[PDB]
Design an enzyme around this catalytic site. Structure first.
Site, PDB file in Angstrom:
ATOM      1  N   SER A 127       2.465  -2.438  -4.586  1.00 21.63           N
ATOM      2  CA  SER A 127       2.539  -1.178  -5.367  1.00 21.63           C
ATOM      3  C   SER A 127       2.740  -1.494  -6.861  1.00 21.63           C
ATOM      4  O   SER A 127       2.432  -0.607  -7.686  1.00 21.63           O
ATOM      5  CB  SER A 127       3.585  -0.227  -4.799  1.00 21.63           C
ATOM      6  OG  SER A 127       3.189   0.253  -3.484  1.00 21.63           O
ATOM      7  N   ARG A 145      16.003  -5.058  -4.107  1.00 24.82           N
ATOM      8  CA  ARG A 145      15.048  -5.262  -5.232  1.00 24.82           C
ATOM      9  C   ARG A 145      15.686  -4.782  -6.543  1.00 24.82           C
ATOM     10  O   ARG A 145      15.689  -5.552  -7.525  1.00 24.82           O
ATOM     11  CB  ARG A 145      13.746  -4.502  -5.000  1.00 24.82           C
ATOM     12  CG  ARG A 145      12.942  -5.034  -3.826  1.00 24.82           C
ATOM     13  CD  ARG A 145      11.749  -4.145  -3.536  1.00 24.82           C
ATOM     14  NE  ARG A 145      12.153  -2.808  -3.131  1.00 24.82           N
ATOM     15  CZ  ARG A 145      11.328  -1.815  -2.866  1.00 24.82           C
ATOM     16  NH1 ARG A 145      10.019  -1.983  -2.959  1.00 24.82           N
ATOM     17  NH2 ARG A 145      11.823  -0.645  -2.503  1.00 24.82           N
ATOM     18  N   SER A 151       4.855   5.829  -4.724  1.00 29.77           N
ATOM     19  CA  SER A 151       3.972   4.685  -4.368  1.00 29.77           C
ATOM     20  C   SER A 151       2.931   5.160  -3.349  1.00 29.77           C
ATOM     21  O   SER A 151       2.844   4.566  -2.246  1.00 29.77           O
ATOM     22  CB  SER A 151       4.775   3.507  -3.854  1.00 29.77           C
ATOM     23  OG  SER A 151       5.805   3.144  -4.767  1.00 29.77           O
ATOM     24  N   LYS A 192      -0.131  -0.559  -9.102  1.00 25.80           N
ATOM     25  CA  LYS A 192      -0.356   0.822  -9.511  1.00 25.80           C
ATOM     26  C   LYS A 192      -0.272   0.950 -11.033  1.00 25.80           C
ATOM     27  O   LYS A 192      -0.860   1.877 -11.595  1.00 25.80           O
ATOM     28  CB  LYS A 192       0.592   1.751  -8.752  1.00 25.80           C
ATOM     29  CG  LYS A 192       0.249   1.889  -7.270  1.00 25.80           C
ATOM     30  CD  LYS A 192       1.279   2.642  -6.457  1.00 25.80           C
ATOM     31  CE  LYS A 192       0.831   2.893  -5.031  1.00 25.80           C
ATOM     32  NZ  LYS A 192       0.805   1.674  -4.227  1.00 25.80           N
TER      33      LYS A 192
HETATM   34  C1  1S6 Z   1       3.677  -0.405  -2.448  1.00 28.95           C
HETATM   35  O1  1S6 Z   1       3.960  -1.561  -2.432  1.00 28.95           O
HETATM   36  C2  1S6 Z   1       3.839   0.501  -1.258  1.00 28.95           C
HETATM   37  N1  1S6 Z   1       3.581  -0.275  -0.059  1.00 28.95           N
HETATM   38  C3  1S6 Z   1       2.408  -0.861   0.135  1.00 28.95           C
HETATM   39  O2  1S6 Z   1       1.460  -0.730  -0.643  1.00 28.95           O
HETATM   40  C4  1S6 Z   1       2.354  -1.810   1.281  1.00 28.95           C
HETATM   41  C5  1S6 Z   1       3.069  -1.787   2.524  1.00 28.95           C
HETATM   42  C6  1S6 Z   1       3.970  -0.781   3.119  1.00 28.95           C
HETATM   43  C7  1S6 Z   1       5.230  -1.136   3.602  1.00 28.95           C
HETATM   44  C8  1S6 Z   1       6.068  -0.187   4.169  1.00 28.95           C
HETATM   45  C9  1S6 Z   1       5.652   1.119   4.279  1.00 28.95           C
HETATM   46  C10 1S6 Z   1       4.401   1.483   3.819  1.00 28.95           C
HETATM   47  C11 1S6 Z   1       3.560   0.542   3.247  1.00 28.95           C
HETATM   48  N2  1S6 Z   1       2.781  -2.847   3.239  1.00 28.95           N
HETATM   49  O3  1S6 Z   1       1.876  -3.608   2.462  1.00 28.95           O
HETATM   50  C12 1S6 Z   1       1.645  -2.964   1.302  1.00 28.95           C
HETATM   51  C13 1S6 Z   1       0.720  -3.624   0.351  1.00 28.95           C
HETATM   52  C14 1S6 Z   1       5.217   1.125  -1.267  1.00 28.95           C
HETATM   53  N3  1S6 Z   1       6.243   0.246  -0.704  1.00 28.95           N
HETATM   54  C15 1S6 Z   1       7.319   0.934   0.017  1.00 28.95           C
HETATM   55  C16 1S6 Z   1       8.695   0.564  -0.548  1.00 28.95           C
HETATM   56  O4  1S6 Z   1       9.664   0.805   0.150  1.00 28.95           O
HETATM   57  O5  1S6 Z   1       8.715   0.071  -1.664  1.00 28.95           O
HETATM   58  C17 1S6 Z   1       7.026   2.434  -0.172  1.00 28.95           C
HETATM   59  C18 1S6 Z   1       7.598   3.252   0.969  1.00 28.95           C
HETATM   60  C19 1S6 Z   1       7.515   2.990  -1.494  1.00 28.95           C
HETATM   61  S1  1S6 Z   1       5.181   2.553  -0.154  1.00 28.95           S
END
Ligand code: 1S6
Ligand code: 1S6
Ligand code: CL
Lengths: 241, 242
Positions: B47, B227, B95, B50
Site C-alpha cells: 500500500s 509499524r 488503503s 499508493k
Molecule cells: C496495503 O498494503 C493494503 N494491503 C495490501 O495491499 C495487501 C495485503 C492485505 C493484507 C491484509 C488484508 C488485506 C490485504 N496483502 O498483500 C497486499 C499487497 C492494506 N494493508 C492492510 C493493513 O493493515 O495495513 C489494510 C487493511 C490497511 S489493506
C-alpha cells in the site's frame, strides 16, 4: 436552513463567558448557532486575517512558497515564539504579526483593497495599511467567516488554486484517524469588546463541518476556551468523539 | 553521513520482531538506521505504492482531484472500510486496493513504466498484472530508496506537476498537533514471502523535517500496530517527538 440551538449557551455559561459558535454542515447545506444576532455581529478579525493576508501575499509573489524563511528583524517582542525565523507554516501556527505586517506593506493598500473586495471579505474596509486588521476599520461576522472559508475550501476565491492549497496546508491545526481540523485563532484587544476567534472547518471521511466562533475575552486567561468550547459543541453534535 | 544505531533494535526485540527503521534529518543532510543492510533490502511496496500510484493518476487526469468519488463496484471484500464509496483522501486513509487497481488499469503498463523510471522508484520493474504488480509482481523498493522518493516528493522535485504532489502530500496526512505533522503511508505485503509491514513518510517540525522508512517481519496480522508504535518509540528516543 439556519437554526438557533440555545442549548449550546450552556457551554459558554459553564465557563462564565458570552459568545457565539456557528456550524455549517456542508452536505446538508444547513447552519446552526447558539445566537443568530451575535453570529451576524462583525468584529475586528485579528489573527484570523492571516488567512486572506497569506492568500494575497502568495498570489502576488510576496511569498514564493511555504518553506521561504522570514528573517527575524532582531527586535525582541512579548511573544517568545515571534523571536526567531518563520515560514508561512510557523507564521500562521504562532500568529506572527510582524511577518504579516511586512507582507501587508509589500502587498500595498491598493492591491490589498482590490483583493478583499474580490474575496467579499467582511466589510472590505482597510481604514489604517500595516495595522487595519488589528485596530482599523475591517469587520467580519462569524457567518461571513464561514462564507469566506467555504469559498477557500472549494478553491473559489479569485486567486490561483495553488495559493489556496498552500493556505489550507498552513491552516492545518490537528489531525487523527477520526477528523482533520484546519483553522486560525484570533485575539482582538485594541478595540472593545476584547474577543477570541477560532474559525476553520472539520474534515470527516464523507462530510465537512465549517465553524466560526468568537467569545468575550476580557483577560488572556480564557484563550484556551476558544478551542475547548468549539470542541464541546462539536462533541455534543457527535461530529467528533 | 549514514550512522548505524543498534540501540533501536531493543524496540523491535521487546515486541519479539525483526526489522529496520531509517530516519533522515533533512537539515543536517544525515541518515540513521538500526540495520544498514536491511535498510538497503528491497521488498514489495504494498500500500506504500499508493503514493506513486496517486501521483501518476493525478498527473494524467485519471483522478481530476481529491473530492472525485470512486463508486464501489458492489463486490463485498474482507476489509469493511472498502465496501462504500471513496475519494483520493479516504482511498489512501483506508488503503483501498480496488480503487488503485482501477487507476493502474487506466494508467496503463506503458505510462506506469515510464513514470516509475522518471521517479527512479525502487527497481522500476512493473512486470506482472498491470493491476497487481505492487502487491504480487516484480516491483521492489528498500527503506533508503523510499526516503529518496519521499525527499523528492517533499520538495516537489518529481517529474509530475507541483499540483499532483501537493494533493498526494495532503492525502498522506495521517496525524497533526502543535508539536508535529506526520504525512505517511502504511503497507502490508502477505502475497509473497517474507510477510512485512511498511510505514514510510516524514515528520514536519517548526524548523526541520525527519523522513522515515520502516519495514518489519509481519508473520501474523496481529503485529500491524507495531509499524507506527516502533517508529514512534524510535522518534521519542531521538527526541523528535515528545
Ligand atoms: C496495503 O498494503 C493494503 N494491503 C495490501 O495491499 C495487501 C495485503 C492485505 C493484507 C491484509 C488484508 C488485506 C490485504 N496483502 O498483500 C497486499 C499487497 C492494506 N494493508 C492492510 C493493513 O493493515 O495495513 C489494510 C487493511 C490497511 S489493506
Ligand atoms: C492574532 O490574533 C495575534 N494577536 C494579535 O494580532 C492581537 C493581539 C495580541 C494579544 C495577545 C498578545 C499579543 C497580541 N491583540 O490584538 C491583536 C489584534 C495572536 N493572538 C494571540 C493568541 O493567544 O491567540 C497570540 C499570542 C497567538 S498573537
Ligand atoms: Cl495538508
Amino acid at each position: 436552513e439556519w437554526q438557533e440551538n440555545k442549548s449550546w449557551n450552556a457551554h459558554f455559561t459553564e465557563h462564565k463567558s458570552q459568545g457565539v459558535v456557528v456550524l455549517w454542515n456542508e452536505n446538508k447545506q444547513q447552519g446552526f448557532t447558539n445566537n443568530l444576532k451575535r453570529a451576524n455581529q462583525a468584529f475586528l478579525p485579528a489573527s484570523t486575517f492571516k488567512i486572506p493576508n497569506s492568500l494575497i501575499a502568495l498570489d502576488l509573489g510576496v511569498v514564493k512558497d511555504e518553506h521561504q524563511v522570514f528573517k527575524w528583524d532582531g527586535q525582541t517582542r512579548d511573544i517568545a515564539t515571534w523571536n526567531r525565523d518563520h515560514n508561512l507554516i510557523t507564521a500562521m501556527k504562532y500568529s506572527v504579526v510582524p511577518v504579516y505586517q511586512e507582507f501587508a506593506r509589500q502587498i500595498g493598500e491598493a492591491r490589498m483593497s482590490k483583493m478583499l473586495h474580490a474575496f467579499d471579505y467582511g466589510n472590505e474596509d482597510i481604514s489604517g495599511v500595516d495595522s487595519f486588521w488589528l485596530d482599523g476599520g475591517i469587520r467580519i461576522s462569524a457567518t461571513e467567516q464561514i462564507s469566506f472559508l467555504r469559498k477557500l475550501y472549494h478553491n473559489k476565491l479569485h486567486v490561483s488554486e495553488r495559493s489556496q492549497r498552500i493556505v489550507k496546508q498552513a491552516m492545518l491545526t490537528e489531525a487523527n484517524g477520526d477528523y482533520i481540523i484546519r483553522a486560525k485563532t484570533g485575539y482582538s484587544t485594541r478595540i472593545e469588546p476584547k474577543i477570541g476567534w477560532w474559525v476553520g472547518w472539520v474534515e470527516l471521511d464523507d462530510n465537512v463541518w465549517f465553524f466560526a466562533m468568537n467569545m468575550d475575552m476580557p483577560t488572556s486567561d480564557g484563550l484556551g476556551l476558544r478551542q475547548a468550547i468549539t470542541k464541546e459543541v462539536l462533541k455534543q453534535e457527535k461530529i467528533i468523539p
